[PDB]
């Protein structure tokens, strides 16, 4: 298995870990803030996914400093992870095309 594919897999497992810890930590950070909605684990997990993918419907979001800091980590982990898959796909195509060109 080439590096890029290995890194892709690793990036994926790591994202899953960030999502779960992010969901757990968001609840921990947000409970105690009057008005917060990111306070139960099931929807927090959903919030973590739509944040990692940067969709951000706006149905749920953190209102506290630490909830927001946790959100930033999730955003960056998602962007980085998917960005890394793109780079792996590019490498795959670059390699295949170099062969097809007989180089």
């Amino acid at each position: 298995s080439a590096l890029h594919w290995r890194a892709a897999g690793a990036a994926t497992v790591l994202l899953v870990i960030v999502l779960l810890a992010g969901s757990y930590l968001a609840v921990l950070a947000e409970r105690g803030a009057p008005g917060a909605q990111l306070i139960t684990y099931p929807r927090a997990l959903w919030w973590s996914v739509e944040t990692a993918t940067c969709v951000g419907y706006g149905d749920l979001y953190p209102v506290t400093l630490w909830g927001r800091l946790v959100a930033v980590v999730v955003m960056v982990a998602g962007i980085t992870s998917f960005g890394l898959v793109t780079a792996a796909l590019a490498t795959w195509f670059v390699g295949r095309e170099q062969e097809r060109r007989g180089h």
Partner: antibody, heavy 118, light 108 residues
Framework: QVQLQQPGAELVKPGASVKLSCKASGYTFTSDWIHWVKQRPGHGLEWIGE????????NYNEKIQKKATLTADKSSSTAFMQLSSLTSEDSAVYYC???????????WGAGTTVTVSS | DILLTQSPAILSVSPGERVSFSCRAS??????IHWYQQRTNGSPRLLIKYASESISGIPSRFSGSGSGTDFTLSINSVESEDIANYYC?????????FGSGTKLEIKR
């Protein structure tokens, strides 16, 4: 089997403090929160606060005067609530309840009747 | 903080009739409402979670409905054992809050 065990009663002198206990059994998850609810005779249910034993973080009802301090003991699976400097206004049944982090109180304790008197 | 209004405070019904308890939230809370039954000198007991989802061990005559700001707890054919106080509770926003409760009376 009873998931939450609470002592039946506690007599407290005005001004004094008491530490109520809530021993939990059954399934325990890192996502569990133990809540405390106050119910005065003839009145409804009033939320006091909550605590997540897996982390030790506690939040309290901001609308009422803070009389409690929540702690938890992971090894003995027990949650505690320290009520301090009580008055007759603190006389009531205090229930502990378990929430799986999904918003509802699936199980409640039998409740401890606290009487503040001389 | 979300205010939960339970009115009327007391509901009288004849044995066997269908009864409905009202719970109105001060703002929209989706379906994050839960219902509890508390009999005289007993501790609260979960009846319905998330507005309409049934709980195991709870008689089938118990059901809930509604979304947004208005919710209903219904009992199909009330019987003596249903005599108690009924409370709604919200978990949409922090902090969780409880309604004032409605008592069920049966006119036998």
């Amino acid at each position: 089997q009873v998931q939450l065990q609470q002592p039946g009663a506690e007599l407290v002198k005005p001004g004094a403090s008491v530490k109520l206990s809530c021993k939990a059994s059954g399934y325990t998850f890192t996502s569990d929160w133990i809540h405390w609810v106050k119910q005065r005779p003839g009145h409804g249910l009033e939320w006091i606060g909550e605590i997540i034993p897996s982390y030790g973080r506690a939040n309290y009802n901001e609308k009422i005067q803070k009389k409690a301090t929540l702690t938890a003991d992971k090894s003995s699976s027990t949650a505690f609530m320290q009520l301090s400097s009580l008055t007759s206004e603190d006389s009531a049944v205090y229930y502990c309840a378990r929430e799986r982090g999904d918003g509802y109180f699936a199980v409640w304790g039998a409740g401890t009747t606290v009487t503040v008197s001389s | 903080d979300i205010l939960l209004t339970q009115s009327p405070a007391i509901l009288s019904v004849s044995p066997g009739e269908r009864v409905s308890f009202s719970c109105r939230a001060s703002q929209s809370i989706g379906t994050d409402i839960h219902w509890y039954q508390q009999r005289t000198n007993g501790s609260p007991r979960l009846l319905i979670k998330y507005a309409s989802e049934s709980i195991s061990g709870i008689p089938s005559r118990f059901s809930g409905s509604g979304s947004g700001t208005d919710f209903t707890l219904s009992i199909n054919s009330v019987e003596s054992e249903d005599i108690a106080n009924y409370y709604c509770q919200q978990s949409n926003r922090w902090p969780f809050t409880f309604g004032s409760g409605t008592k069920l009376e049966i006119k036998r």
